Amino acid sequence: IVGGYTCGANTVPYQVSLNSGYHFCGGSLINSQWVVSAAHCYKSGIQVRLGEDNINVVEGNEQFISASKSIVHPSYNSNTLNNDIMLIKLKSAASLNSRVASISLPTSCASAGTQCLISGWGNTKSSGTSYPDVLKCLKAPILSDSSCKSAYPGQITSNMFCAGYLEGGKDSCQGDSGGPVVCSGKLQGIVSWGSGCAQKNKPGVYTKVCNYVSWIKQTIASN
Numbered sequence: 001i002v003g004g005y006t007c008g009a010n011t012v013p014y015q016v017s018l019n020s021g022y023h024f025c026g027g028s029l030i031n032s033q034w035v036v037s038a039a040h041c042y043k044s045g046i047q048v049r050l051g052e053d054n055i056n057v058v059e060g061n062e063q064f065i066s067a068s069k070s071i072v073h074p075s076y077n078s079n080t081l082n083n084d085i086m087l088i089k090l091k092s093a094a095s096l097n098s099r100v101a102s103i104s105l106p107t108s109c110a111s112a113g114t115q116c117l118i119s120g121w122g123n124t125k126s127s128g129t130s131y132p133d134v135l136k137c138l139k140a141p142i143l144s145d146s147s148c149k150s151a152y153p154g155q156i157t158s159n160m161f162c163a164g165y166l167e168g169g170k171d172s173c174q175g176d177s178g179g180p181v182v183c184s185g186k187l188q189g190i191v192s193w194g195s196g197c198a199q200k201n202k203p204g205v206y207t208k209v210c211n212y213v214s215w216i217k218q219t220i221a222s223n
């Protein structure tokens, strides 16, 4: 997250870190057994880390739970990032508590102009590299479909939305991929892609989770 703030320990209790020997992507806990992330974050060998603040220090509220199964969307296209969504099942249910909590899935799609909370342990620099240890947060508005398409001509599908600031300076970034975009208390987006981070006229692009609620529900009913 570039241009964000330190969230505060465990104030985003649905945020997970996906670990394969190192943090590599975020995700969101949607119930005691299941995480939603980006399909482009697929790796074999995922451990889900819940209750994290500093990902490099064991502080006492963590739950580390291996994935048993990962399910990339059936129509994920890794070239365009259309349908950039994945489900990860935990080998055992998380113990839900004040610091490890699920986020609701949406009923309706979010509205342009809504300010959402985006969070992660990704790079904090637009030019260069610096990865934080503690979780960072950003409030960013959903942009109109016409603005998003103007920013990325011939690249935005109905399963994507843009959020952020066209003047640059505030965005998600590498290592935030897969993490949450929460709008009116529901998971509306997944950190998916963008050209660079926090560059002028190149806002973040996010998987539009409201398009996937029936897939998510039937998949969790069946696995």
Ligand SMILES: [Ca+2]
Residues within 6 Å of the ligand: 052, 053, 054, 055, 056, 057, 058, 059, 062
């Ligand atoms: Ca930790």
